[PDB]
Amino acid sequence: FRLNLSVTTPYNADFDGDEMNLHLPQSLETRAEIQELAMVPRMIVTPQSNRPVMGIVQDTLTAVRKFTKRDVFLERGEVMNLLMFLSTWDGKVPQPAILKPRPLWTGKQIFSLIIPGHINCIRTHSTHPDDEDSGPYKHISPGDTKVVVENGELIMGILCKKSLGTSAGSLVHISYLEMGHDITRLFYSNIQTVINNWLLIEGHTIGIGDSIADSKTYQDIQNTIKKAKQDVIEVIEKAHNNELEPTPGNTLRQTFENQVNRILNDARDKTGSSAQKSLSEYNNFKSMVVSGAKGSKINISQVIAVVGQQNVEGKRIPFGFKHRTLPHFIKDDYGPESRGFVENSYLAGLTPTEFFFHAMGGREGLIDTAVKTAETGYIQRRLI
Amino acid sequence: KAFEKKFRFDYTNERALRRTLQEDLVKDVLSNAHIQNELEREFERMREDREVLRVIFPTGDSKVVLPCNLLRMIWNAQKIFHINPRLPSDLHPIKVV
Amino acid sequence: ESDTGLWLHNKLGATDELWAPPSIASLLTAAVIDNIRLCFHGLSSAVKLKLLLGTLHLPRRTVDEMKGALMEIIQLASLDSDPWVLMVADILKSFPDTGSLNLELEEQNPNVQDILGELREKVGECEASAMLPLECQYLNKNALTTLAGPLTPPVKHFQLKRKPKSATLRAELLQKSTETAQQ
Amino acid sequence: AGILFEDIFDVKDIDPEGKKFDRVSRLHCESESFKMDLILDVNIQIYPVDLGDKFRLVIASTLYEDGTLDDGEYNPTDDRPSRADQFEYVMYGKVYRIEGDETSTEAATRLSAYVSYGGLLMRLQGDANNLHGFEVDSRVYLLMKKLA
Amino acid sequence: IPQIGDKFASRHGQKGTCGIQYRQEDMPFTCEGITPDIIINPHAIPSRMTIGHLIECLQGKVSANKGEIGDATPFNDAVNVQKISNLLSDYGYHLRGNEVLYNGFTGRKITSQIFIGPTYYQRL
Amino acid sequence: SRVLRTSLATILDGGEENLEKNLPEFAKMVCHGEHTYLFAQAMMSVLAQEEQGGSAVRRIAQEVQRFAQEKGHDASQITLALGTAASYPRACQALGAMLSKGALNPADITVLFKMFTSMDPPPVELIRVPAFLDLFMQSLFKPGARINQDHKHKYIHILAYAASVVETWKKNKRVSINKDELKSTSKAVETVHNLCCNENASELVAELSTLYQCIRFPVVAMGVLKWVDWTVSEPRYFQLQTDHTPVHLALLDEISTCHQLLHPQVLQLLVKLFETEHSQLDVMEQLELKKTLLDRMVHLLSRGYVLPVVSYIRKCLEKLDTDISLIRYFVTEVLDVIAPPYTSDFVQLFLPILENDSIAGTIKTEGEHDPVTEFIAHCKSNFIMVN
Ligand SMILES: [Mg+2]
């Protein structure tokens, strides 16, 4: 069953061996009933949270985010290739944004040819600076991060998942409400077709070049891990000598564990931020995160910089042996590496104790996923 | 005071009415006092609505779900009817009320 | 250039601002100044005041190139009946010549005389517990003794029974700093 | 004849807070005479602009010197003489916002027109006597030409 | 015969059915004549975080060029990605396995530089 | 001119208390037009020609110049054009470009340093300008902002010559200067910049006796105050916790102890931290952090600087109220250390916070020395009934 891409999101169907069921309505009356109630254009906006469910899925979303940037220019032949795929094109090639020296179209003009009717929305791109609308340039955005669609034409801004996704007030939700629902079916189809066919010209990848920071960043990461590790060791030598004082409301041990978890979470956050200041704007991890298509900043921090503290039941790796976590550690070792903090990243790879502690955290996640299903289904059954 | 500045439609000022309305509508507003009474009564209703909302919403937030997106509809009317909002307008505020 | 009085009134005549606008050294070239010198009595007093204050924001070498033309603009500025242009010309007449502004503003002006007389009396009678300048947070004890007299002691508003617990804090941290120094 | 605006500017800054896009940069420019600011997105690849340049910039409602008022379709075969042969960098776009220093009592003195050329933004902040030809949601051309 | 719907998988939990089969003239190609056999999604990587797939692909280029079956024991410290990249750079490739693919339909070379190289796929 | 005259008379009859209240109401006039700024600063120069009380005039000129730097003037060129520094041209031109950039260039300080430490120094009032020393503190004692180890000693020698040497202007000429304490000043500022460069906190506890030796010097104490400002006011700092981290606050106590002119900046730092809500901390932990800051305010109250502190405590009990338990702890710690006699201003300012709004919480278990009852009895004995 070849079915389309944007219908993946309401179905939660990710094509990795998923099989679907297809019923045929036998009467003509129930055929008209399904056509007038349960068509997927008539099921774009959900009643549960008054927002759409379709949205624009991953590869169309990154390609449309790279497409609608300010520095995207299109030759006449590439424009005529792209406009071949618009179903709703009235046959008029638009006037170029650059007439001389060369007739050269901006990608926002082709995207304005996509956007149907005359709809008007103002959204913000995922990396819009919050201090931009305070000072100047709040209408002439220097990062091109303020989406304005106006009179059915994309004035400005880069379209991330906050513009085309399933968030409420997005461009597709307003295209549902102001225009029709057949028109939004056309809008989804036109976005998918013409942005995939631009993506053939552009091309999009991910690689091992996208997972390596320059050596100054690695020096920053290792200096931060060394500083936080020495800080945890000096908290430990304060805790042994009874110089640690208890926080009001808990024991001295829970005070200690708050200090150690606070230092290690600060280390994870500082190394995560210092990793993600070094993508150089072509890194494809940043290309998928900024569009919001697939992943987050945490995945960038864990691939480049540091995996971080591994947890089992919301606290650290417990002492399964007698007063030690693994038989490689000395007894009563409350340090970072003994208790499950992983200082390596997925680019460098984990040491075997960090591998095993990481496998513990992953087993906790899989146990959650496997035990959740029956109880949630039974709650749904009782409610219905 | 921000509520009274933003919603009252102060009619006594000449020059603001000259900038916002056309001169026949300006002398229509400034001459008649019945229209001034109806504008004062709709500001009375908006003070009443403000007190009703502050009883309904004791937490100071206003992100509320409602059917017609009125600001987007006003902006659609602007873009369809080609307003050019630098010029003085030509709808009578008693037609609005 | 041509119509240069209108050009100065266009680039500088936004009367809603009163500071010397930036890029004033890029608006004052020696050819432009030598165009000002013949149309100086035509342009308005606000633009003229912007001009006279912008002539101080030039770098020193550009002033030292053609200080004679700037002094000619000063001499034409001292003849004007405006109070601001006359006062600023009286201040600014010594800036291209020496580098320092004027300090002898006392003649030809009863205003400066009244302000200086009343304020010399006021400064002479207000020496008690004087406000030390912002440099006095920096220079040393004996250097402050050289500059502005000795240290004025605080008002003893009360009597202290015992030293507060910050004395215990500094004693304990000095003990900790001895114990850490010997490790 | 159809020109809304014409002035000589002078490039003071090229994208001074860093370069957000490699192919297009914004130019913070002051006018030569009229005392007005212009922030302009230009393609550096096909038309390089260096700092300290001086250029003419002519917003025109149409390129055709008779003022025939085309719709805005791409007609590469029209041999009607347009004004673009005088210039070397022609951008077509719509003017989307005219904000200004105005008060509810008296008129606006300093206007600020905003115009997007496809996606390439341009703010022109000047006086109201020079920006009077601009109207919100109309279609303008750019016509810049650098000169020594 | 492998057709679409047939479920393939890497050695890293990167499964997926066959979406489509293009012929060789439609498939992209390097500066040399090498087309891909599989083209996998770039979005399959960053949330799943199989960086070991990328490192297997890089060490696969190094292995197939050097003429030796490369080593991928987990806890080694004699093989990190920088040594793999320095070994790949000697055989006339990019450091990080990226290679300029040409498009198979239009022939215009793809603006991005596609990560390419041999992995080990399993048919399920 | 006359409005300027009466406002100067108002401020100069006011004092240091009126320095905070009247100075924006004075500075919005004289920074409105920059030509008015030129007129006002020229009057400041001619009035500060006299050594008989002209220091307050120079102070008011420096706050007007600081407000001009805040609002957006490039008023440093006016400031140097008023000065005698323009008599020696190229040094003043270097200062003009550098204070027009508002940042330190190492090549520019080599240009300065080649002119200093010779047998013909400039008159020392060219380097005593406080915005220049503030840019020194910014470029030198930020916890980041590394300085490249080669012109570093030139920086330290310039600050030492600024804050060290004396002179004798016997009819506009100097005949006896000395340089015999700027080696100790250079050693102190070098040790402190090394301690701010090493960024290792067990070492910060270790060399704290040497750091206490350093803060005997005023420029060292001002620099450590700016460094602890820039260190402690980083968000999510309070996660090292020793006695809720009083180490840098013990350096606040050292700065407050060994000097007195820094006390407004010290109080400004403490009331900036006290108003700052610290997210991600426990609420008891926030409350004990506030107790520690109030312990520091009590230590400022002990060393003479009392009336702005009690004025702030009254301001935060009355206007925009903080926790009442913090004010109760402040009253408890202040009344455990003070003894009669009592100056009438302290009684007048300390009375309404004590008698209104939590009488009862002050006495729980004191006994051996009586509580607030003694202060009430002394307050009845001082005033005229209480009035
Ligand atoms: Mg599945």
Rounded Cα gap, residues A125 and A161, in angstroms:
8
What CATH superfamily is the domain D5-148? Nucleic acid-binding proteins (2.40.50.140)
E56 touches E120 (CB < 8 A):
yes
Tokens of A199: 């993506």
Residues forming beta bridges with residue E16, ordered by sequence position: E8
**What three-state secondary structure class fits F118?**
coil
Q: In degrees to the nearest 10, what's the CA dihedral of A327, A330, A332, A335?
A: -100
Rounded Cα gap, residues A108 and D96, in angstroms:
15
CB atoms within 10 A of CB A221: 24
Rounded Cα gap, residues D48 and A305, in angstroms:
39
* Number of cross-chain residue pairs from A and D with Cβ atoms under 8 Å apart: 106
* Nearest chain A residue to E114, by CA: A205
F8 touches C66 (CB < 8 A):
no
**What three-state secondary structure class fits A296?**
coil
Burial track A106-131 (b if 16+ CB lie within 10 A, e otherwise): bbbbbbbbbbbeebbbebbbbebeee
The burial of A151, by beta-carbon neighbours within 10 Å (0-12 exposed, 13-18 middle, 19 or more buried), is given as buried
Do residue D92 and residue A99 have CB atoms under 8 angstroms apart? yes
Nearest to A158 by CA among A125, A185, A129: A125
Tokens of F180: 């015999």
Nearest to D47 by CA among D91, D93, D88, D92: D88
Cα F27–F28–F33 angle (5° rounding)? 100
Which H or E run includes C159? strand C159-160
F2-14 helix and F23-30 helix, angle to the nearest 10 degrees: 160
A268 touches A342 (CB < 8 A):
no
Between the CA of E124 and the centroid of ligand 1 the distance, in Å, is: 15
Q: Which residue has the tokens 């009356």?
A: A29
| Rounded alpha-carbon distances, angstroms, from residue A136 to A133, A148, A156, B76, F224 | 7, 17, 17, 27, 36
Q: How many Cα atoms sit within 13 Å of F292 on the Cβ side? A: 21
Rounded Cα gap, residues C137 and F265, in angstroms:
10
Between the CA of A18 and the centroid of ligand 1 the distance, in Å, is: 5
| Rounded alpha-carbon distances, angstroms, from residue F63 to C129, F27, F57, F269 | 18, 9, 10, 19
* Nearest chain A residue to B76, by CA: A120
Taken in order A159, A164, A167, A169, is the CA torsion positive or negative? Answer: positive
D1 touches D124 (CB < 8 A):
no
Task: Note every long-range contact of E1-8, with CB atoms under 8 Å and residues 24 or more positions apart, other chains counting.
Answer: E2/E123, E6/E123, E7/A16, E7/A17, E7/E123, E7/E124, E8/E38, E8/E121, E8/E122, E8/E123, E8/E124
Rounded Cα gap, residues A57 and A49, in angstroms:
19
Q: Is A141 on the interface with D (CB under 8 A)?
A: yes
| Rounded alpha-carbon distances, angstroms, from residue A284 to A54, A293, B95, C151, C170 | 24, 11, 56, 65, 54
Rounded Cα gap, residues C79 and C86, in angstroms:
7
| DSSP annotation of F219 | H
The burial of C88, by beta-carbon neighbours within 10 Å (0-12 exposed, 13-18 middle, 19 or more buried), is given as buried
DSSP E strands: which ranges in chain A? Answer: 73-74, 105-106, 121-124, 146-150, 153-156, 308-309, 341-342
Spatial neighbors of C113 by CB under 8 A, at least 6 apart, are: C106
Q: Is D35 on the interface with C (CB under 8 A)?
A: yes
Rounded Cα gap, residues D41 and D20, in angstroms:
11
F8 touches F60 (CB < 8 A):
yes
Task: Note every long-range contact of B21-24, with CB atoms under 8 Å and residues 24 or more positions apart, other chains counting.
Answer: B21/B88, B21/B89, B21/B90, B21/B93, B22/B88, B22/B89, B22/B90
CB atoms within 10 A of CB B61: 6
Backbone angles phi, psi at E114, to 5 degrees: -80, 130
Spatial neighbors of E110 by CB under 8 A, at least 6 apart, are: A200, A201, A202, A203, E28, E100, E101, E102, E103
Do residue A93 and residue D73 have CB atoms under 8 angstroms apart? yes
F283-302 helix and F247-258 helix, angle to the nearest 10 degrees: 10
Spatial neighbors of A223 by CB under 8 A, at least 6 apart, are: none
Rounded Cα gap, residues C133 and C118, in angstroms:
22
Q: Mutate which of F239, F247, F291 to test chain A, going by most A C-beta atoms within 10 A?
A: F239
Which H or E run includes F87? none
Tell me whether strands D120-127 and D24-31 are parallel, antiparallel or unpaired. Answer: unpaired
Burial track F96-117 (b if 16+ CB lie within 10 A, e otherwise): bebbeeeebebeebebbbebbe
Chain C hits for F7, Cβ within 8 Å: none
Backbone angles phi, psi at D90, to 5 degrees: -110, 120
Q: Is A103 on the interface with D (CB under 8 A)?
A: yes
Structure determined by: cryo-EM
| Rounded alpha-carbon distances, angstroms, from residue A322 to A112, A280, A330, A352, F82 | 67, 48, 10, 20, 78
A94 touches A109 (CB < 8 A):
yes
Do residue B76 and residue A177 have CB atoms under 8 angstroms apart? no
Spatial neighbors of F364 by CB under 8 A, at least 6 apart, are: none
Spatial neighbors of D92 by CB under 8 A, at least 6 apart, are: A95, A96, A97, A99, D72, D117, D118, D139, D140, D141, D142
Rounded Cα gap, residues A141 and C174, in angstroms:
55
Spatial neighbors of A274 by CB under 8 A, at least 6 apart, are: A217, A220, A221, A224, A305
Type of residue at F190: E
Tokens of C16: 């809603």
C9 touches C43 (CB < 8 A):
yes
| Rounded alpha-carbon distances, angstroms, from residue F125 to F54, F130, F161, F180, F278 | 14, 11, 11, 19, 42
A157 touches A145 (CB < 8 A):
yes
Nearest to C18 by CA among A61, B4, A2, F73: F73
Residues forming beta bridges with residue B59, ordered by sequence position: none
Rounded Cα gap, residues C157 and F324, in angstroms:
25
Tokens of B22: 């056309």
User: Within its chain, how far is the Cα of A61 from the centroid?
Assistant: 11
Backbone angles phi, psi at E53, to 5 degrees: -65, -45
**What three-state secondary structure class fits A337?**
coil
CB atoms within 10 A of CB A259: 21
The burial of A278, by beta-carbon neighbours within 10 Å (0-12 exposed, 13-18 middle, 19 or more buried), is given as middle
* Number of cross-chain residue pairs from A and F with Cβ atoms under 8 Å apart: 21
| Shortest CA gap B55–chain D (Å) | 33
Cross-sheet strand order for the sheet of A121-124: A121-124, A146-150, A153-156
Which H or E run includes B52? helix B34-56
| DSSP annotation of E42 | G
Do residue A234 and residue F202 have CB atoms under 8 angstroms apart? yes
Residue C59 preceded by cis peptide, ω within 30:
no
Do residue D105 and residue B15 have CB atoms under 8 angstroms apart? yes
Nearest to A336 by CA among A357, A314, A321, A352: A357
Rounded Cα gap, residues C77 and C71, in angstroms:
9
Residues forming beta bridges with residue A150, ordered by sequence position: A153
CB atoms within 10 A of CB F302: 22
CB atoms within 10 A of CB A137: 18
Q: How many Cα atoms sit within 13 Å of F21 on the Cβ side? A: 10
C25 touches C57 (CB < 8 A):
yes
Which H or E run includes A93? none
C4-12 helix and C45-54 helix, angle to the nearest 10 degrees: 80
| Rounded alpha-carbon distances, angstroms, from residue F203 to C101, C179, D82, F145, F200 | 51, 12, 76, 20, 5
Backbone angles phi, psi at C104, to 5 degrees: -95, 90
Spatial neighbors of A367 by CB under 8 A, at least 6 apart, are: none
Tokens of D145: 């030409």
Rounded Cα gap, residues F333 and F330, in angstroms:
5
Which H or E run includes F221? helix F218-232
Q: Which residue has the tokens 């220093």?
A: D101
User: Within its chain, how far is the Cα of A342 from the centroid?
Assistant: 24
Cα C170–C173–C179 angle (5° rounding)? 145
| Shortest CA gap A248–chain F (Å) | 6
**What three-state secondary structure class fits B55?**
helix
E111 touches E2 (CB < 8 A):
no
Q: How many Cα atoms sit within 13 Å of A337 on the Cβ side? A: 14
Rounded Cα gap, residues A244 and A292, in angstroms:
44
Tokens of D25: 């940069």
Chain D hits for C27, Cβ within 8 Å: none
Rounded Cα gap, residues C73 and A73, in angstroms:
53
Rounded Cα gap, residues C76 and C73, in angstroms:
5
Rounded Cα gap, residues C73 and C68, in angstroms:
9
| Shortest CA gap A179–chain F (Å) | 46
